[PDB]
Design an enzyme around this catalytic site. Sequence first.
Site, mmCIF file in Angstrom:
data_model
loop_
_atom_site.group_PDB
_atom_site.id
_atom_site.type_symbol
_atom_site.label_atom_id
_atom_site.label_comp_id
_atom_site.label_asym_id
_atom_site.label_seq_id
_atom_site.Cartn_x
_atom_site.Cartn_y
_atom_site.Cartn_z
ATOM 1 N N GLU B 70 -36.270 83.372 -29.749
ATOM 2 C CA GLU B 70 -36.000 83.391 -28.314
ATOM 3 C C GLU B 70 -36.629 84.561 -27.588
ATOM 4 O O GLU B 70 -37.073 84.410 -26.438
ATOM 5 C CB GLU B 70 -34.475 83.319 -28.042
ATOM 6 N N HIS B 140 -21.682 77.390 -28.876
ATOM 7 C CA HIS B 140 -22.251 76.195 -28.244
ATOM 8 C C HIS B 140 -21.465 75.895 -26.940
ATOM 9 O O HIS B 140 -21.547 74.787 -26.383
ATOM 10 C CB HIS B 140 -22.163 74.988 -29.168
HETATM 11 C C1 LIG Z 1 -30.765 82.075 -32.282
HETATM 12 C C2 LIG Z 1 -30.605 80.558 -32.516
HETATM 13 N N1 LIG Z 1 -31.577 79.744 -31.997
HETATM 14 C C3 LIG Z 1 -31.508 78.393 -32.152
HETATM 15 C C4 LIG Z 1 -30.444 77.776 -32.856
HETATM 16 C C5 LIG Z 1 -30.334 76.251 -33.046
HETATM 17 N N2 LIG Z 1 -30.650 75.849 -34.414
HETATM 18 C C6 LIG Z 1 -29.659 75.600 -35.353
HETATM 19 S S1 LIG Z 1 -30.383 75.165 -36.911
HETATM 20 C C7 LIG Z 1 -31.997 75.333 -36.239
HETATM 21 C C8 LIG Z 1 -33.082 75.076 -37.258
HETATM 22 C C9 LIG Z 1 -33.024 76.156 -38.378
HETATM 23 O O1 LIG Z 1 -34.157 75.986 -39.236
HETATM 24 P P1 LIG Z 1 -34.168 76.655 -40.641
HETATM 25 O O2 LIG Z 1 -33.877 78.125 -40.492
HETATM 26 O O3 LIG Z 1 -35.522 76.430 -41.207
HETATM 27 O O4 LIG Z 1 -33.092 75.976 -41.571
HETATM 28 P P2 LIG Z 1 -32.833 74.480 -42.121
HETATM 29 O O5 LIG Z 1 -31.872 73.888 -41.119
HETATM 30 O O6 LIG Z 1 -34.079 73.700 -42.246
HETATM 31 O O7 LIG Z 1 -32.186 74.672 -43.501
HETATM 32 C C10 LIG Z 1 -32.055 75.689 -34.915
HETATM 33 C C11 LIG Z 1 -33.305 75.904 -34.030
HETATM 34 C C12 LIG Z 1 -29.466 78.715 -33.382
HETATM 35 N N3 LIG Z 1 -28.351 78.287 -34.119
HETATM 36 N N4 LIG Z 1 -29.556 80.093 -33.202
#
Ligand SMILES: Cc1ncc(C[n+]2csc(CCOP(=O)(O)OP(=O)(O)O)c2C)c(N)n1
Lengths: 336, 336, 366, 366
Positions: B70, B140
């Site tokens: 972000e 959220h």
């Molecule tokens: C600071 C923040 N930005 C965005 C989100 C929304 N979000 C939740 S899971 C996610 C994807 C996470 O990807 P990854 O770290 O690769 O893990 P995976 O779910 O593939 O195991 C996002 C963008 C969040 N929880 N916190």
Amino acid sequence: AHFTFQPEYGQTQKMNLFQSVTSALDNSLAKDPTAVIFGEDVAFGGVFRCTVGLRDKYGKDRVFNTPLCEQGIVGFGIGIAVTGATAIAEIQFADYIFPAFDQIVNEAAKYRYRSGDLFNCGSLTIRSPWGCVGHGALYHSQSPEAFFAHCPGIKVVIPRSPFQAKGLLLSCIEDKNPCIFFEPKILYRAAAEEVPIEPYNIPLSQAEVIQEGSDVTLVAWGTQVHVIREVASMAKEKLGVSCEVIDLRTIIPWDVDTICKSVIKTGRLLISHEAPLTGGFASEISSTVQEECFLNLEAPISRVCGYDTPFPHIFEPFYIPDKWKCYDALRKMINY
Amino acid sequence: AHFTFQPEYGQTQKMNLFQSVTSALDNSLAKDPTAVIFGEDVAFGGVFRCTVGLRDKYGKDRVFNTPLCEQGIVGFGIGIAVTGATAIAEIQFADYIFPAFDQIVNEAAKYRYRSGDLFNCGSLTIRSPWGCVGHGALYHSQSPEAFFAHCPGIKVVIPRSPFQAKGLLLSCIEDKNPCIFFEPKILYRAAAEEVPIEPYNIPLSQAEVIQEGSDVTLVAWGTQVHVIREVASMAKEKLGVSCEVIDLRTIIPWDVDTICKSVIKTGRLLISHEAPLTGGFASEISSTVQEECFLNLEAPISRVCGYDTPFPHIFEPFYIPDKWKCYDALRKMINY
Amino acid sequence: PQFPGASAEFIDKLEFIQPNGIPIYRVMDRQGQIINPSEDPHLPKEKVLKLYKSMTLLNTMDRILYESQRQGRISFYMTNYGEEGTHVGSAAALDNTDLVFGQYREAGVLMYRDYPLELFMAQCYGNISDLGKGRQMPVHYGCKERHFVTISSPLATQIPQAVGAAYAAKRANANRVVICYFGEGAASEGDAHAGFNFAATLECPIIFFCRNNGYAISTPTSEQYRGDGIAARGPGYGIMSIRVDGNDVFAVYNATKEARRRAVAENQPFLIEAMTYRDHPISRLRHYLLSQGWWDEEQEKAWRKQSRRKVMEAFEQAERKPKPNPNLLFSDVYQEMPAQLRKQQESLARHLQTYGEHYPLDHFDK
Amino acid sequence: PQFPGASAEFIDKLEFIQPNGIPIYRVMDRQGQIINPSEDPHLPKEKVLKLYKSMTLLNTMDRILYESQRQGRISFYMTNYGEEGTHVGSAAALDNTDLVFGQYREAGVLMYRDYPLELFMAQCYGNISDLGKGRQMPVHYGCKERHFVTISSPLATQIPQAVGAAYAAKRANANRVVICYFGEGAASEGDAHAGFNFAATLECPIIFFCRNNGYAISTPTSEQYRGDGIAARGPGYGIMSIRVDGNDVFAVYNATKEARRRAVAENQPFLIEAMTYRDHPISRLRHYLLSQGWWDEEQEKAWRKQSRRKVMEAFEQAERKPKPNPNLLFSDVYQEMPAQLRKQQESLARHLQTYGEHYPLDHFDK
Ligand SMILES: Cc1ncc(C[n+]2csc(CCOP(=O)(O)OP(=O)(O)O)c2C)c(N)n1
Ligand SMILES: Cc1ncc(C[n+]2csc(CCOP(=O)(O)OP(=O)(O)O)c2C)c(N)n1
Ligand SMILES: [K+]
Ligand SMILES: [K+]
Ligand SMILES: [K+]
Ligand SMILES: [K+]
Ligand SMILES: [Mg+2]
Ligand SMILES: [Mg+2]
């Protein structure tokens, strides 16, 4: 200078504000084996000298420098605190605490609540230089307390002198909640008074009436306390007005009772702070006092604050809520 | 559900709130060749479907995903805007806007002022889902507007419906100042009404009186507008009280005149918002109204807000400033 | 040279350094066969069966809680499909008291540490048995007893925190390591850069465990980074790194065991990047069990039955428990409760006395 | 393999990747001699003399403004000592319209771009000639005409911003590159990780120019990072990188010229890490000038005299100009001025009408 500083626990020694911070830090590390101090350039004593001699006295593993990354400094501090050790993090200027806003607001403030008290970071304290300094302009002059005031879970504390700073900082370090302690940098060298050499505590969430009065209540914190103290003197001399002067000391959770008790008596209130008007903490105090003291208010509550602009370099003399601005507002409120 | 949604510019079409955002974005990219939309997962349409079909229609170089960061998204957006191109950045949930706080507050808000207008990022708009959703818990459900309200240089705008959202978002995108547009996510699917297919603008910094009344003024924004609209109905039915209902729409710079004009007439004011009480934006409105309408205020201004705690998961029904909480406060204020 | 920034010599020709493929460490093939005898950890039958049962029980719980979410019985859920081996395999290599920080895919660590099915479910339902007091969204687990730090939604925030806990462990000098799990998407956050750099410069005994499954929601890794994954970033921070096959519990175990041994001894961080996806960890280990004569079809059927039964008993119990007293919405904001917060609590009690019929009080304790 | 995260093969033995020294590219030695003829840029005499004069004039200004700060005539100052070559050398390799983002040590870029001595000084004094309207602290320069984005105090914030400007340049397709200067300390901020990663994944024509002088205030690099400097981080982000001798203007020029050529052609980022300190860039170039017969003692004396004179004339003028109208404290907060901000401006005018004798009005315009 826009202000003038004017000055039971055992032996004392004259100390300016940065020396009193060093004394608080020294007392802390001496009595708490887990305590560590870290941040940007704290090893050699700091850019404001607040940690001079501490690394030599307590060891490089207890007083150390971190990479240049404020979000890292706070997340790292939180992690130390989670294990139960005392973590005293330094953010070089309050203007640079923003990269750490997410770690402070979404993490530190909510750590205990969200885990049902299975984990916490109560032994974390973040100290940071704060307030105007005559020429700091946009990024060496900020007063960020109102941003933090809207975050349940943290305490925000601002002292007005060397004696107050050591007692309040020791209380923050020992408090069981993450605390942000803002040190008015314009006072680091300017203010000097007798300070107990041994540790002592000043309670958090308790304002201090430093002068009794019967016509109006004046509230401020940090350096601005000295400005309103002078304004009280001007009002007495020029208007025959008796002013009650109050140092708020803790921004959140704040001492609502001391402030309302004072206003119920005087019937008038003026709040002043260097931070911009809109969204500033005076709005919270004003709205609250109005709710609790509606029947006693004889005139509208006035807020004498910085303007709703970034903090300027060459225009600083015209930007700050100085004694003349406060005095004029008070004159008009008295005349209401 | 805690609320009930209830519904000149040419042809219209029924649209829920996410569809109206998509329509605003579509109109924008069509008439502004420089405009781009980017963020986390916006390429495939977004987690709330607000960007569906836009990449296929305008190209992968104009609607694209960024790495998960972000602070990066906002700094990147600022940079695009500095060249004069329209940058529409998405932050997935308002709860995650905090890592970007420094870029928003120290950079975007101050860009024009600090350069003497040699540079600016006025063509930047940050849009983000906002507000409670029944079970979003701590991260959220947040309503961060009060944190941003204390920062001179940015505009903060919150719509209450599909028609309002498209007009206000188009105004933010075209405004010459960095804007944060908060989309009440609980309304994305819940609220649907006729929305002009072509572009139109709703002015920023202008509140909207949606119902005239003579006994009390009720102010809110976002979903809470529908709650106070219902409360107005309850007061009329149960108390014979005439309520004036006002949607603030722009948090900063806010429409002080419309609010004061209303209170001068009614003599009573109740402000409500999902965000926590302390430091919340109702404090600013209350302190200001008290300063401008002291002589007209018949009773203390009431603030019915979320409690001073993080936003809970299982306790949400008990946390929100619902219609019964607002109604009871109004009853007591009327009885004052 | 004589420069205080980096030890190096001079070069007389202009040459840009190009992003110079890290191989994937594997111990057993898709058929469950040990590829290289010198890499066999030779874990005891009891331990290996525990790895297998922990993974399958997690899968059984996932199936039921996933369906529960679909019916709206719980408000949210995240499964562990494809991540059973990375978590049970790495957890088996840790000492029981090593502190764990993670995000959403770490329930297998708790399962291996014998966290009760009743508690996984109490958190998802936010019922009276939840030590988290029903405050966070489902799957935001935490256990002080099992040294598993409560999960929070903001991605990557736990990374620099894990580094600080590791620094404190070093100072306490009690032979403990901290492990911090995160996804390749989360590695893009500024907090990840902070944690990696602090861990190296402050010499912290921590294992960074990155799960790389090629996607962060709808975003492929091509839009997430351009170097050779996350493992390739380790050297640049001065961190020992390795890439492993996430569908191979033994490869994961070996890498974590060695990283733990060296991190604690040398006070230095290690980065393990486990490749997984959307040849499943459960399937591969089952083949291994069969080859050793440690499992058979009848045992598989009996276990599938005993696990389904264990999960449903916890499930039924979780659903009938009441939610916590609404007063719990106000405690733990601060350790003590500020008088102004108590005033708000009293305000709610008064409100419910009068308007209570409009709230779901029958569902909440007291 | 078949993994969507990284192209690689398997390895059958457990091996941790160790932080595998990037050499320092040099063109001329401390005696001003070209080391390798094929690396000589053969810049024309006029251009090289401009490099030399820009560097020395900056040094002359630094000396006077530094003393000015010591006497409290200006409130703050940052010198350019040791950084004259990195900035004039890199600026000479850029096209005049390439956009520059920087921090505190980039005045040499403006000097090369012919920024008036009068404007450097107007900003430091905050006088009426400052287009910045006296709002920021000294040395926070900016020039729209010379494509030099106004400096701000928060470290590293300009890095992801520079990447966004580069992305927009790419889209506008006008053969422009963006250069972004920062120190090795600033590279520790999360914003640096953001900028590097975004630049690689979004394919941006940008040059990251990192000055590594071994210290961030009192912090040595040993406390700043543990890998091989900042250049070693480039490959891990998928960024072409190089390390150069910051006291060698020709090495700096060559690396920047080639990085610019490839960044603009390939839409890909380049990282240049220039090693400097606290064999000075001015001294080394002067030796080169002498060897070509392009400078002599008499020319050195005449220039030192003409520059001192030019700087003092600008200095005296800057000090006698008044400061801007106090009304300028209120404009540019937003493009337009909100009615509530105008109300505050009117409030000040009213205040000064009555209490003006207590303010330094004689010093301000109008
Ligand atoms: C600071 C923040 N930005 C965005 C989100 C929304 N979000 C939740 S899971 C996610 C994807 C996470 O990807 P990854 O770290 O690769 O893990 P995976 O779910 O593939 O195991 C996002 C963008 C969040 N929880 N916190
Ligand atoms: C976010 C932020 N944190 C801290 C500071 C204070 N500060 C100003 S310069 C500096 C050192 C910068 O080091 P480096 O980037 O290496 O540059 P150098 O001064 O050596 O050229 C620090 C910590 C700041 N301006 N901004
Ligand atoms: K504390
Ligand atoms: K805009
Ligand atoms: K987290
Ligand atoms: K900057
Ligand atoms: Mg992933
Ligand atoms: Mg440096």
